[PDB]
Amino acid sequence: ATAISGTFFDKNNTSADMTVRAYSWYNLSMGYLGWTHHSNWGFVKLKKGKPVTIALTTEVSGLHPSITVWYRAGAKNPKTLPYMNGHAYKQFGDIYEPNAEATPVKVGNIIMKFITNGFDRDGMGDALPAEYDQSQLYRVMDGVPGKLAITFTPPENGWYQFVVGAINPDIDSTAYGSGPGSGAGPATAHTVHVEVSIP
Ligand SMILES: [Ca+2]
Ligand SMILES: [Cu+]
């Protein structure tokens, strides 16, 4: 496992500004993975059965925010929350790292059950490049570039661990910058505003 910086949310702290790289959720290398540390992580404790919405917005021209939500099952001490199983992540699918260790600390079993994901597909044009042709990378349109909402109903009480990033910045836009490079794009950190609607 590897430590991450988490932003925690609750009923009195429903919003945050997170900073992410333009390609952070979908690098153009390898297996087209997100970069754990180029993205930004949130945590929120939720009650079973009541729908939740997370809304992302950005002012950055060309930027398309994105998000993956997992349920962090069996989490015990909250100080064991801000870890990930590695420096890269698949945008969908479940994560399992039994008896996980990081920097040494013992984190316990990391069990992350996939809940939902989405990315802002408004403004990307008539067709995305073929590198993005994975069905479970949920393309969502609300008619507003730079805005995204996801929803889910917590299947279990407890901690929901989510990553915010961005994907496929518009060619030659501010967000695109110098382009994908080696796959991670520019190191520029762009602000995405996050609002969690806790029931
Ligand atoms: Ca949108
Ligand atoms: Cu990393």
Author numbering: 28 to 130, 136 to 231
Quote the passages of the study that discuss this structure, keeping the authors' original sentences.
A copper repressible protein, denoted CorA, was previously identified from a particulate fraction of M. album BG8 cells. In the present work, we show that CorA is non-covalently associated to the M. album BG8 outer membrane and exposed on the cellular surface, contrary to the previously assumed localization to the Gram-negative inner membranes. Furthermore, both endogenously- and recombinantly expressed CorA were purified to homogeneity, and inductively coupled plasma mass spectrometry (ICP-MS) analyses demonstrated that only endogenously expressed CorA binds copper, one atom per molecule. Moreover, our findings substantiate that CorA and its homologous proteins MopE and MEALZv2_1030034 play an active role in the copper handling/uptake, which again is necessary for providing copper to pMMO required for its methane monooxygenase enzymatic activity.
